[PDB]
């Protein structure tokens, strides 16, 4: 399948310690990524994708939008 561009967050976890998360980016849905996403950035430097199916999601709809 001729690979078009993809979402940065194709898969996610609900499982993360909030103590670790220094920051939080949210980006809308777009033509280059159908689902919206949010990128939690940790203390050590990594970034992670967190689930919008979980009730980490009601702090999105309101948040950016």
């Amino acid at each position, epitope marked *: *399948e001729d690979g*078009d561009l993809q979402c940065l967050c194709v898969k996610t976890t609900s499982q993360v310690r909030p103590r670790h998360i220094t920051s939080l980016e949210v980006i*809308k*849905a*777009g*033509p280059h990524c*159908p*689902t*919206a996403q949010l990128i939690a950035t940790l203390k050590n430097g990594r970034k992670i994708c967190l689930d*919008l199916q979980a009730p980490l*999601y009601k702090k*999105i*709809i309101k948040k*950016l*939008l």
Partner: antibody
Amino acid sequence: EVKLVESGGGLVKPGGSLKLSCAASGFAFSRYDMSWVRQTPEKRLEWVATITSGDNYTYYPDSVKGRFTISRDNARNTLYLQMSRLRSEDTALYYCTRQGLLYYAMDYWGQGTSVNVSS
Amino acid sequence: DIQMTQITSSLSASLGDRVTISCSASQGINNYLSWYRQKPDGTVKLLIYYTSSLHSGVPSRFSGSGSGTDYSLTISNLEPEDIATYFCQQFSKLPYTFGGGTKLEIKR
């Protein structure tokens, strides 16, 4: 209600011009991606245009590139579709729509302003 | 371009029935499908987004499903407000393409 009134639709002669308008009401218009879709007389639906709410880009399909020109005015809460060099095929009912937020489908559509196009 | 194929132009179903309305896709979309309903006259309104998540103000009898290239909308106990045409869109990639539409009519 989220509401989308549309206007400017009418009869135009082939190779002509027309500017459709779509008045928005019931949401933060500036922070929403907006689009235009049309319904052929044949009946089928057809994507026409989209515009990024971070002011940025416009996206059109091959069938109308360069002829059509989507544009917004966040001050007015109004979305324009600037049509020119019209054709037989462009005869259709033109809906303005709202993309956006979590999953990027068109969640709200207007009544629909009509564009009959003949000589 | 993704050819979105809604195989049954129209389909017959008596009132109070269970209706399945299939929409197949030329290539894999990532359950980024939609469903729309157009009242014979009225505007169209978003029914389901993603593949199965229902839009606000949509009855509970509407339930989407599917994965890959095949998808279905399905309406338990059909009500006369639902005699209409139904459309599937995909939004996985540009250009956004719709289905041919399925008209719903009542069997006699």
